[PDB]
Design a binder for this molecule. Sequence first.
Ligand SMILES: N[C@H](CCC(=O)O)C(=O)O
Ligand SMILES: [Ca+2]
Ligand SMILES: [Cl-]
Length: 250
Amino acid sequence: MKIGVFDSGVGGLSVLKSLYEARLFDEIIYYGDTARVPYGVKDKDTIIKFCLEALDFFEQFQIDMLIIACNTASAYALDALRAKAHFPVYGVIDAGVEATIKALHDKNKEILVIATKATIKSEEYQKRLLSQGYTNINALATGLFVPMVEEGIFEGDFLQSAMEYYFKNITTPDALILACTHFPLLGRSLSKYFGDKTKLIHSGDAIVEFLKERENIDLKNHKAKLHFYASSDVESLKNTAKIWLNLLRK
Ligand SMILES: N[C@H](CCC(=O)O)C(=O)O
Ligand SMILES: [Ca+2]
Ligand SMILES: [Cl-]
């Protein structure tokens, strides 16, 4: 089982970590479009175009399956990606919704979706939740979280002001969907901001359960062999990857 993992840049490592630790695969190819990141503040057409180029890049690897780690790309490009690919392609949005339903199991509970501008604008989360009868939803772009995470700001007064700027006079949700690859890095601060009543829905953990229910995968004895590629400064991606996944252990 050799799969591909696509993200707009470095943030998708949160999803990779999930897939890595779940021990589902022999081998994983991670590609980050670091030369053109972010996607979240750009337009639909551009996002779809960039995703198709990524699929082109993965053509050289003989992968059995492609996971779109990026929520933004998952929001707009799945249709095109699936029309072109001849192997299963999965995004994280569908998975995120069902993990939310599984966490709450009560259509009356309150849900907050936080993501990039483009992901929110797609209304893809909203659409899936509503169709399942979950109508107590709020969707909110919190875009500054991405470059803050990338600058290594995961807590403190700077981040507090960021949350208060985004979360002023909004209600505390029974669940918040971390609908952005970067957001698990802010998991503790977010949870501290909202309190323990709010369940955090993690996209990476979500896609893992999603695959386990959809596929028949034996749990591996050994960790997958990881491969890192990037459109720019691949060593920087690898450096970040080493820190976030801790690829320095035994
Ligand atoms: N990877 C993107 C966040 C960074 C970007 O804007 O490209 C996402 O999950 O939505
Ligand atoms: Ca197909
Ligand atoms: Cl889509």
